[PDB]
Design a protein around this ligand. Structure first.
Ligand SMILES: [Fe+3]
Ligand SMILES: [Fe+3]
Ligand SMILES: [Fe+3]
Ligand SMILES: [Fe+3]
Lengths: 211, 211, 211, 211
C-alpha cells in the first residue's frame, strides 16, 4: 500500500504568540495520529477480502466507510503539513508583487483579503483557506467545517488556518481572535510566495479546463 | 459580483442508455438551479451590510451560511459541467497510452480502475471521481456524499460520475448499476484525455508543493 | 442481535396524487434496504472481535463506522414507517381539537403550520418533521438533510414528510411542490391524532426533565 | 419569539478530575454562546420578511440556513444543560435497581454498558449518549459527531458525555481517556435515576407508537 510518514522537519518552534506547549500536542498527537490512521486505512483498503468491492453499498459497506475516513485522515495530514510548513518565528519575507496584484484584482486588496481570511476563520469550525480555484483562475477563500467537509475540488491552497479547538485551546482557550492575529505574525511569506508561483504556473496548463 | 451563466452547449442528447427525458430535468432544472443560486449568493456576499464580516461567527452568521452554501452551489455547477461535458452518444475515442500507463502504475490496470470506479459510484451518495491528487501525483478515486462533502482539496477531476438520485431515477428508478454501465458506454475519451494532459502538465509545476 | 423485519402492512396503495409506480420502489427497494442493512450492522456490532471496542477511535475504527451508519439505517427504517403509516387514499379524519389548539398556541394556527411545513419541506434535502419537543413541550418543525443529519434529540414525530428525490421523482421529477400538496391530500388524521395523544401523555411524565 | 436564558444554577464546581479552570470557559463562553445564538435565530425566524417562507429553497435561502443552525444551537443548549446538570463533586448516589436491570437486559450488564459508553466517547467527535429509544423501548448508545449530527429522533437522554475538544483540553489536552474516567467519577446518580423514571413512564404512553 502507499503509506505515509510524518515530516518532523516541519515542526515549528518558538513562534510569536503560539507556544511550544500548544505546538507539542498538535504536532505529536493530532498530526501524527492522522498519518497513522491513514496508513491503517491503506492496509485495509488493499485487502480485497476485507474491503470487498463487490459489496460496495451506500447504506453501509466496509469499502464505503474506509473511503469516507480516507478523505478525513488524508486531508488531516495534508492540511497540517501546509499549516506547520508556513510558520516561522516572527514571520519571514513579504508577499510578492505578483501575489499582491492578484489579491488586489480578485479580492480587492491586502486589507480586504486579511479581513476576509479572519472572517472565514471566525465563521468556520475546521479551517479557513486562501487558494487558487483552478476552474476560474481566481483566488478564493474556502472555509471548511472539518478536514473533509466543504472543501472545494481542485483548489490549490496558499494560506491554511487551522480553526479546530486543539489548535489554540492551550494558549487562548475559547478566544480565537488573538490566535488568528498570532498566526498572521508568524507567516513565512517565502513559502507562500513559492506556492503562488507554482499555483499560477499550474493554472496556465489548466486554463479552459471546462470548455 | 462574479456571476456565472449556464453552458447550454454542454447539454448531451441521444445518449445510449440515458434518455433525453432523463437529461432534460437534470440539465434544465438541477444544473441551472445551482447556477442561479450561486449568483444569488454572490450578490448577497457583495453586500457588506448583509454579509457583515465583523459579525462572522461559527454558530450562526449571515456570512457563514452564505459561504457554506457557496461551496454547495459552486461545486454543483462545476461537477455538472464536467459530467455533461464528457458524455457523447455511444462514446468517442479511447483512453490515451499515457493515461493507461498511469492508471496501470497507480491503480493496477484498466480492469482494476473500472471496478474501483463502479464500487465508489455504488458506495457514495453524491459523486464518484477519478482524478489526479496534486499532493502525491497519483490518480485516486474520490467519493463524495454531496457536492461539497468529502471532496479532496487540490484534486484535478478526470472522470466524474453523478450518483444523486435525480441523475438516474427517470430511466432506472432505484437501479443504479445499469446506469453506471450506461455512463461508461457514453464516455468521450477525447475530453478525458485532454483533461489528463493538462492535469499532468499542471502537476509538473506543482511537484514538491509540500517540502 | 436485535434484528428488524419490514412491516408490509404499512404499504400504501391507490393514493391520490402519488402513484403505485412511485410507491413500489420506495417501499420495496429503499425502505426494505434500510431494514436489511440495519440487520447487517447489528450482526457485525455483536461480534466483539470485528467491532473491537478497545480499538474505538474517532479518526477511524470498525466500531465507529458501524455506529455511524447504524443511525443512518435505523432512522431510515423508523422515518419511513412513520411516513407510509400515515398515508391513506384521499386522506382520513381531521386534526383533533386538542391538536388544533396546541398548533394554534405554538405555531400560530393551522394556516401558519401548513405554510411552515411546506417551507421546511422545500428547504430541506431529507425530511421535514412536525413533532413535540420534549424539552420545551412545544410543537416544532424540524428539517433534516438526511435520515441522520439535523435530527433533534428527544423529538416525538407527528407528521413526517420525505423529501429525498426517490420519494417523488417517478411522479413529479424535479417538481417538489405538487408532491407536497399530494402528501397533504392523503394524510390519515386518525394516525396523527393518536400520535399526538401519546406524545402529550408522554410529555406529562417528561415535564421539567432539565431542572 | 421563544427566547432562552442560561441556567447558572447548573454550573459545576470543585469536580474530581475536572478543574474549575476547565469548567469556566465551557460554561461561560461555549454554553452561554449557544443560548445567545439560539435567541438571535429566533428573532430572525420571527421576521417573515427576513426569513421569507415563500423563498424556501434547499440550495440556499435565509429560512433554510436559520433552521439548520437552529438545530445546532438548540442542541448545544440542551446537551450542555444535561451534561452540567448531572455532575457533582465526587459523584452522588448509585444507579437504581430498575436502571441496573434494564441495562442488564438491553446492554448485558453495568460492565458492558460502561465499556460501551467509553468506546462511543472515544469513537465520536461530538457526544456519546446513553438513552431510551422510544421506538423500541430499549436503552441505546448514540454517538454524535456534532450537536446536530447523528442524533436519533425521539431518544430520551439519560447520560450525556461531551467529547468536543473544549470539554477536556484545558486539563488533559489531547488525552481523552483520563477525561472520560473523571466524568464517571462525578456522576450524580440521583439525577440520572430520575431521568430514567420519567423516561420509562413516558415510554408506557409511547409504546406501540408505530403499529
Ligand atoms: Fe489541527
Ligand atoms: Fe446531478
Ligand atoms: Fe424515502
Ligand atoms: Fe461542550
Amino acid at each position: 500500500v502507499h503509506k505515509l510518514e510524518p515530516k518532523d522537519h516541519l515542526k515549528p518552534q518558538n513562534l510569536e504568540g503560539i507556544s511550544n506547549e500548544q505546538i507539542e500536542p498538535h504536532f505529536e498527537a493530532h498530526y501524527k495520529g492522522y498519518v497513522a490512521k491513514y496508513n491503517e486505512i491503506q492496509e485495509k483498503l488493499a485487502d480485497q477480502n476485507f474491503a470487498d468491492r463487490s459489496k460496495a453499498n451506500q447504506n453501509y459497506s466496509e469499502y464505503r466507510e474506509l473511503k469516507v475516513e480516507e478523505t478525513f485522515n488524508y486531508m488531516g495530514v495534508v492540511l497540517h503539513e501546509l499549516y506547520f510548513g508556513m510558520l516561522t518565528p516572527g514571520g519571514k519575507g513579504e508577499p510578492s508583487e505578483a501575489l499582491k496584484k492578484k489579491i488586489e484584482e480578485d479580492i480587492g486588496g491586502l486589507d480586504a483579503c486579511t479581513n476576509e481570511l479572519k472572517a472565514a476563520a471566525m465563521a468556520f469550525r475546521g479551517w479557513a483557506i486562501l487558494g487558487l480555484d483552478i476552474f476560474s483562475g481566481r483566488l478564493v477563500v474556502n472555509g471548511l467545517d472539518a478536514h473533509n467537509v466543504y472543501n472545494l475540488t481542485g483548489l490549490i491552497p496558499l494560506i491554511v488556518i487551522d480553526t479546530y479547538e486543539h489548535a489554540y485551546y492551550v494558549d487562548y482557550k475559547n478566544k480565537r481572535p488573538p490566535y488568528i492575529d498570532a498566526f498572521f505574525k508568524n507567516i513565512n511569506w517565502d513559502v507562500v510566495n513559492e506556492r503562488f508561483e507554482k499555483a499560477m504556473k499550474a493554472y496556465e496548463a489548466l486554463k479552459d479546463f471546462i470548455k
